[PDB]
Design a protein around this ligand. Structure first.
Ligand SMILES: Nc1nc2c(ncn2[C@@H]2O[C@H](COP(=O)(O)OP(=O)(O)OP(=O)(O)O)[C@@H](O)[C@H]2O)c(=O)[nH]1
Ligand SMILES: [Mg+2]
Ligand SMILES: [Zn+2]
Lengths: 230, 189, 79, 199, 119, 50, 352, 87, 149, 228
């Protein structure tokens, strides 16, 4: 075995959302081996934070309509699914949003909690039409992984049923898109030696660099079981 | 509904003589496939009558059928349901193979129902006129059975029979192609 | 067997009689609590009877002979 | 909307009547997830009555097939509109056009028999994006009748019933608005007078 | 074969044939077998073809005839003849909810027929 | 998003679905160009041209 | 309450317990079959593809009845008489009904079918395993024409199997399919490009030589390999797939001036309505056949493949042509109105 | 019960009388107020049997203890209600 | 016009694309037609159609189980379906379906108790539909008797 | 992270060559992730020894025929591809095969050589027809990995290439077949959970149980660059 390890070379960060990562040198065939294995974990297994429960005062269910608000509660909730959140310390944080008057309610109207970071403060949530109208809600953000729909969550625990809580989808998975390209790394001697270019596209939260590190960690954790137990 | 396999062998020699469906040149349905999995009637051997080749009530397996083709047997009297003597049902031997099982039919099987279903199903599920000249595909001699024609001033044989069967005989003397000649036909030869 | 019952048909012959004989034997184990000749291996009474028939342990004639034997032993005890 | 349409899309959405269309036009004075008030233009606005049109939108209502009928506002606050402009979208309509379903990235090719005879292989992304998630509103009635033995009572006071069940019913014996329910939960408590008590 | 079930009879035997009664072929063959051994008046026969509908109504089970078609007519003709259905066919047994005389039931059914000989 | 079976087309002789798919991708092709130009702001003049 | 222990008990009861599946209409006996059930999460019944033929089951919303045989006798009659595996041959004709199609046949066809040279034409392998290793390594196409060494097992006069080793001129793909093929069968069965018609014969042959359990295993294997290679390929449809004959308008304009000449001769005096009706129908009927034949001669073949040096002709891998030639779905008739001429249509009276 | 055959024959007037358990004289079905069977009506309990299991109409005999006990007052046999499908 | 529009999108004129298998990462061996089809979810949801029944309420006269999911009904075992069991061997399956599964009142309860007792024995009886048939023929004034052994 | 680790459950060893390995429990999607990743390493990255070059005396090229030998030279070379060889110390060894007389020439006729070990000495190479016929060749075994054909060897290495040296395909890889099946592992609570069934098939130079261990090891060695 003349073992030949790759090392992380170039991190083009085109945007906070989109980031390209070249990787070399790779031995022949390891391009696709690592490329797909990482793609699968990055789509299905990636950990993140997302809105789980929302409680608006003066709102019993998600199908009602609040006066002075253009959007029905369902449409407001769908906007909160797209709310990009980082929790630093705790696993579960409840943010408060109180706003009034005429204007597009943005994510910045949420009371900035110390550890919590809102990635997109200009994110639209609600449009207030009448000046007398005020909206007040308590948005719970939990940390998990993958996709946890409200329907899969309405058939598990449900120890308490407080008439007033609304369950909405929360895509924990930060990763929106991922593709890997195997290009030739015309290596000093070897022409079969190749590079792996991983084009990642996330929403907020996870850093591209950090996410790749985590995904490789999960794969290596799973291999400990096979290298160890025979 | 009532028809059930009641007996194993009625011990009758009666048999429906089944010939090869050779309609429209290309054999439509071979005799081998038409008598495949049916009890044979009358010790029917090879051309030379001096040594028995096949016995009596013996299931025709694909192996027996392949032997039949080397010898080119055209006609075979086989035991049939219609000619079975069994009162209040039919014998396993007159019927033959349960086509669904691939072996001899079991006594007690409700045959009639299977028959009705199997005739009925295709119908329920299933719910070029350039024939001017007969051209013959393989060389041979013209055989005209059932034919009464008059010679016209052209030199040509103009047929005036209703039922006319032109056949194509080879060398050895077997029938291989058929061709229904109509009324009002000009024969070349 | 487990998958297919062709082998057990080849032992007795009539599919119909195979079913009667396997039924009779499965009833013995179901009701009488008759011990199975082959290891159970978490198999239902329907499959065990077919195993026993396949291997040629169970059969209409054999079952009848042992019925007479147990029945004569009970006659002996009563008299 | 349909990406590949014909043009009948808009005609059908408007003529069906399920869309709110502007008779008078003018500028929108007030939008709400419930109502649209438009201030009419002087040229169509008659000098007799006050020239303010109110279209009340129908919110999330039951259909005959128990599908959902919801009207949402199309226009924004302070938008100028002409006669015959779509003011609010009906249930299966995009900005004025008829939108019966959802267009999707489709590829024609076998999968491991998961598309055998017309069988369809769909991405999880479709479920996540709640595309083809559908809303259904069912109507259940509870009838209090008068029998030979006597009138039936709609009390929360029901013989042989768990506190779990009666938690969801309020004083009269009616489930609360907003309450999630599942098979066997009592919606309206009703008790019937029994004559013979022989046991 | 089911089409060619019935046969018309000429002359008499030792039973009640006389001119032109239509009886099933199996039953007249049974008579002819015992007649040929014992003698008595020989009976000339002629097989008749029945096309499906009539052949099914000519079956000597009136429970099968009634279930098929024409139930009103079948039951008046059976009621006047005082006809007795011994439940030989499959339709007859399915109607009374019994074991079919075929497949699995053929074993059991043949055991009942021999129980008719004694006990 | 969806994987449909090729064999349910030539027997069915509804070729409309295939033309709809080709045009649908072309429609979305131009939507993807406009989406790209809107993400990068660019000129109202240039968007107007395209 | 649907308690967790109840699921474990239910799993234990269903074990080795057969269930009857029925589809309307039940035309023949195979419209009811018994299966051993497999508990699945979700509300839809899952049906095995190969029996879809007997039920005439296609999954565009068909439904099925489930029935539970309760007695030991009913369980045995279901397992022995009515089981799917045991009802392989039809009660009508000897030809069997259990046979895969669609994707399953498409995948087998792609692999079996061999193209010109491709990757690693005319290599030599030690058995199908070197072949599999070559293909999966990416040094060989499935359609590479290369000689491999395969050892077939032919039955002798008794029950003993004779072993025979010989070099075969087939393709990588067919060698790898030989691995699925049970011992007893000839290699000539896999050596052709396989379609649904050939695979049905393959399973019948295997049933009559080897017997039931081997054909059962072999049938499963064919399904697994067929799907597996069916997704590895990826043929589909398009807009250029349907090739149109270049000399279509030449046969249309000729036929069209011809029919025009007979319509002008109609006012002259040689023609009744019946005579001209027959003459025009004959002209268009021959034109249709002509355009269809030219369309089928530009689609079936018309493959300019430069072989290892110069040009060759071989069979086209045009997608719709492969679908039709394999017998996977459409027939030549359906392709006649797809890329060819639609033809003469007949009125509800039957007159054309 | 297990039988051999079934026969069909014309019903004699007297045969018809054998199966009968009484002559229904009146068209009366049930009483509009006490929805119980009328005297010698089409649903008469005196003829076809008791409406409720082992209970006479006027209610004097109840429970499985009373078996075939034809109540003197109303004239209703204390048997199962099943009888009203067979009589 | 469609190919011209595709060129404006910088998409292929064939409208076929190179695709990669998500599982293996390897490419599919030929171009695949990809694009946007407008798709519809029809009213026929599996949620509404799945139905199952072990035992339930039973019909008034015929005593057979009711039909329909709204009435918690047994599936109809029709003439066609019966003939299938006749073609096979299956005599016990058929009797089951005729008797303890439908009319036979005593039989169905007795066999339920046996199945919980784990006896898996039938103990058949007489279908109530047939008892009715007899009563309906006697109501016509035809004497129809069962003749004993 | 509620991480859910698999553990090696059952090792059915049907033969020293063929061995089935069930693996559970696996989370949804890891069946194919681990299944394929391992399949690719086990085919194209398992290292081994194989015959690269063969020089037979009295043979100028591989298309000729030697008298007294049933098999053409091509067929002989194909048999040498199937020759199972272990080199202990060296990376490259040239073995000599000299044999005469009537009989099936086996791998035992190769002159031993201390470090080199021939796994299948009964391996058929040549059939000699006439007794006067003698065959002599020098078989070069190199150590490499994956599959390196003569077509991919002439396009890369263009150094010393004299006429007479017969080049044959060298199947370094000890793994002959590998396939993985994902079956549903109905798990306490999760029905989404699956099992991985890896059906391996080598020649016998490398142990399947050890080969899987090696393949996973190579995979984890590549993850050393991504820190954790
Ligand atoms: N039994 C029954 N079947 C129907 C009815 N209407 C449509 N079908 C069936 O619905 C099916 C619709 O087409 P397919 O079965 O897919 O047709 P096909 O024979 O597979 O041919 P292709 O469409 O070319 O693949 C046919 O099998 C019809 O028999 C009906 O009223 N009753
Ligand atoms: Mg179809
Ligand atoms: Zn009283």
């Amino acid at each position: 075995t003349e073992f030949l390890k790759p090392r992380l070379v170039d991190i083009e960060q085109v945007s906070s959302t989109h980031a390209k990562v070249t990787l070399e040198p790779l031995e022949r065939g390891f391009g696709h081996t690592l490329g797909n294995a990482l793609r699968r974990i990055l789509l299905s297994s990636m950990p993140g934070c997302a809105v789980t429960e929302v409680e608006i005062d003066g709102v019993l269910h998600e199908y009602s309509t609040k006066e002075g608000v253009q959007e029905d509660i369902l449409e407001i909730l769908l906007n909160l699914k797209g709310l990009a959140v980082r929790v630093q310390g705790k696993d579960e944080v409840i943010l408060t949003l109180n706003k009034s008057g005429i204007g597009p309610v943005t994510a910045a109207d949420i009371t900035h909690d110390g550890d919590v970071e809102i990635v997109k403060p200009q994110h639209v949530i609600c449009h207030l039409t009448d000046e007398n109208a005020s909206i007040s809600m308590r948005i719970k953000v939990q940390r998990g992984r993958g996709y946890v729909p409200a329907s899969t969550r309405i058939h598990s625990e449900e120890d308490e049923r407080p008439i007033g809580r609304l369950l909405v989808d929360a895509c924990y998975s930060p990763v929106e898109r991922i593709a890997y390209n195997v290009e030739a790394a015309r290596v000093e001697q070897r022409t079969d030696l190749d590079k792996l270019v991983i084009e990642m596209e996330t929403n907020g939260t996870i850093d591209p660099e950090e996410a790749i590190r985590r995904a490789a960690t999960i794969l290596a954790e799973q291999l400990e079981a096979f290298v160890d137990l025979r | 509904q009532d028809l059930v396999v009641t007996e194993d062998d009625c011990g009758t020699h009666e048999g429906i003589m089944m010939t090869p469906v050779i309609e429209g040149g290309d054999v439509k349905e071979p005799l081998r496939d038409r008598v495949l999995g049916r009890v044979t009637a009358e010790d029917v051997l090879k051309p030379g009558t001096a040594d028995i080749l096949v016995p009596r009530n013996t299931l025709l397996h694909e192996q027996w059928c392949d032997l039949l083709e080397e010898n080119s047997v055209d006609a075979v009297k086989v035991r049939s349901v219609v000619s079975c003597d069994t009162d209040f049902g039919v014998c396993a031997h007159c019927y033959g193979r349960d086509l669904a099982r691939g072996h001899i039919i079991n006594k007690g099987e409700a045959i009639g129902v299977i028959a009705a279903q199997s005739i009925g199903e295709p119908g329920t599920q299933l719910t070029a006129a350039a024939e001017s000249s007969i051209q013959v595909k393989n060389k041979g001699s013209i055989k005209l059975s059932n034919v009464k024609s008059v010679v016209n001033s052209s030199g040509k044989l103009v047929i005036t029979s209703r039922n006319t069967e032109l056949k194509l005989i080879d060398e050895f003397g077997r029938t291989k192609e058929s061709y229904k000649v109509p009324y009002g036909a000009v024969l070349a030869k | 067997a487990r998958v297919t019952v062709q082998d057990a048909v080849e032992k007795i012959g009539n599919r119909f009689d195979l079913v009667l004989v396997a039924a009779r034997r499965a009833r013995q184990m179901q009701v009488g609590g008759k011990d199975p000749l082959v290891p159970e291996e978490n198999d239902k009474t329907t499959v065990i009877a077919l195993r026993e028939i396949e291997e040629g342990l169970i059969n209409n004639q054999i079952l009848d002979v042992r019925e007479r034997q147990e029945q004569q032993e009970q006659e002996a005890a009563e008299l | 909307k349909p990406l590949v349409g014909t043009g009948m899309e808009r005609a059908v959405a408007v003529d069906s009547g399920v869309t709110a269309v502007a008779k008078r036009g003018g500028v929108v004075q007030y939008v709400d997830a419930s109502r649209i008030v438009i201030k009419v233009n002087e040229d169509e606005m008659y000098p007799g009555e006050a020239g303010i049109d109110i279209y009340n939108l129908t919110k999330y209502t039951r259909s005959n097939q128990n599908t959902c009928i919801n009207q949402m506002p199309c226009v924004s606050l302070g938008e100028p509109v002409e006669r015959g402009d779509v003011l609010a979208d009906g249930p299966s309509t995009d900005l004025g056009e008829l939108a019966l379903g959802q267009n999707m990235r489709v590829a024609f090719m076998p999968w491991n028999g998961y598309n055998f005879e017309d069988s369809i292989l769909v991405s999880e992304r479709v479920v996540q994006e709640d595309r083809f998630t559908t809303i259904h509103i069912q109507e259940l009635a509870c009838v209090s009748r008068d029998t030979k033995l006597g009138p039936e009572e709609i009390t929360a006071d029901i013989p042989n019933v768990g506190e779990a069940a009666l938690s969801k019913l309020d004083e009269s014996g009616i489930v609360y608005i907003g309450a999630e329910v599942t098979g066997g939960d009592i919606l309206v408590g009703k008790v019937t007078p029994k004559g013979e008590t022989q046991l | 074969r089911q089409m060619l079930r019935k046969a018309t009879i000429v002359n008499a035997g030792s039973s009640d044939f006389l001119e032109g009664e239509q009886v099933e072929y199996s039953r007249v063959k049974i008579a002819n077998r015992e007649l040929e051994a014992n003698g008595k008046v020989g009976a000339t026969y002629s097989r008749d073809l029945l096309g499906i509908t009539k052949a099914s109504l000519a079956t000597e089970s009136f429970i099968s005839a009634a279930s098929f078609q024409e139930t009103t007519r079948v039951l008046t003709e059976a009621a006047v003849a005082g006809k007795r259905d011994e439940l030989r066919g499959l339709k007859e047994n399915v109607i009374v909810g019994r074991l079919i005389p075929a497949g699995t039931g053929y074993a059991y059914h043949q055991d009942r027929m021999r129980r008719r000989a004694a006990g | 998003d969806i994987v449909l079976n090729p064999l349910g087309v030539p027997s069915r002789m509804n070729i409309g679905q295939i033309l709809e798919t080709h045009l649908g991708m072309a429609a979305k092709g131009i939507g993807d160009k406009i989406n790209a130009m809107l993400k990068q702001q660019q000129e109202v003049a240039k968007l107007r041209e395209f | 309450r649907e308690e967790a222990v109840v699921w474990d008990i239910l799993d234990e009861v269903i074990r080795e317990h057969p269930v009857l599946l029925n589809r309307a209409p039940t035309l023949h006996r195979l419209g009811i079959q018994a299966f051993e059930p497999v508990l699945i999460e979700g509300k839809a019944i899952q049906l095995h593809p190969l029996v879809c033929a007997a039920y005439n089951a296609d999954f565009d919303g068909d439904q099925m009845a489930v029935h539970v045989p309760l007695t030991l006798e009913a369980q045995l009659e279901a397992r022995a008489l009515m089981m799917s595996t045991n009802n392989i041959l039809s009660p009508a004709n000897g030809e069997p009904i259990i046979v895969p199609s669609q994707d399953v046949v498409l995948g087998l066809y792609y692999m079996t079918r061999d193209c010109v040279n491709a990757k690693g034409e005319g290599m030599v392998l030690t058995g199908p395993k070197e072949a599999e290793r070559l293909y999966r390594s990416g040094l060989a196409s499935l359609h590479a024409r290369v000689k491999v060494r395969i050892t077939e097992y032919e039955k002798d006069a008794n029950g003993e199997l004779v072993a025979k080793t010989s070099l075969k001129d087939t393709t990588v793909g067919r060698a790898i399919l030989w691995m699925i093929v049970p011992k007893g069968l000839p290699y000539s069965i896999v050596n052709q490009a396989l379609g649904k018609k050939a695979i049905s014969k393959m399973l019948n042959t295997c049933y009559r030589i080897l017997g039931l359990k081997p054909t059962v295993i072999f049938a499963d294997q064919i399904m697994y390999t067929g799907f597996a290679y069916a997704a590895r390929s990826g043929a589909s449809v398009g807009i250029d797939d349907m090739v149109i004959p270049e000399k279509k308008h030449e046969i249309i304009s000729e036929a069209e001036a011809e029919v025009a000449e007979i319509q002008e001769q109609f006012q002259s005096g040689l023609v009744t309505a019946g005579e001209r009706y027959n003459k025009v129908i004959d002209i268009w009927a021959a034109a249709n056949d002509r355009v269809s034949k030219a369309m089928m001669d530009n689609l079936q073949t018309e493959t300019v493949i430069n072989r290892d040096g110069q040009e060759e002709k071989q069979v086209s891998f045009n997608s719709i042509y492969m679908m039709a030639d394999s017998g996977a779905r459409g027939s030549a008739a359906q392709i006649r109105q797809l890329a060819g001429m639609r033809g003469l249509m007949a009125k509800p009276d039957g007159s054309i | 019960e297990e039988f051999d055959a079934i026969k069909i024959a014309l019903a004699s007037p007297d045969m018809i009388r054998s199966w009968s358990f009484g002559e229904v004289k009146k068209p009366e079905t049930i009483n509009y107020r006490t929805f119980k069977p009328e005297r010698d009506g089409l649903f008469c309990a005196r003829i076809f049997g008791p409406v409720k299991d082992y209970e006479c109409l006027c209610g004097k005999y109840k429970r499985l203890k009373h078996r075939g006990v034809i109540c003197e007052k109303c004239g209703v046999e204390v048997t199962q209600t099943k009888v009203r499908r067979e009589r | 016009e469609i190919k011209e529009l595709l060129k404006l999108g910088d998409l292929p004129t064939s409208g076929q694309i190179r695709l990669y298998d998500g599982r293996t990462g390897e490419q599919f061996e030929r171009p695949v037609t990809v694009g946007y089809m407008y798709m519809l979810k029809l009213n026929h949801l599996v949620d509404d159609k799945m139905h199952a029944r072990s035992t339930g309420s039973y019909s008034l006269v015929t005593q057979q189980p009711l039909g329909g999911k709204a009435q918690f009904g047994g599936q109809r075992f029709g003439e066609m379906e019966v003939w299938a069991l006749e073609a096979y061997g299956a005599a016990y399956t058929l009797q089951e379906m005729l008797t303890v599964k439908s009319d036979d009142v005593n039989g169905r309860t007795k066999m339920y108790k046996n199945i919980v007792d784990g006896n898996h024995q039938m103990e058949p009886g007489m279908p109530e539909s047939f008892n009715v048939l007899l009563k309906e023929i006697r109501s016509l004034g035809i004497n129809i008797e069962l003749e004993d052994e």
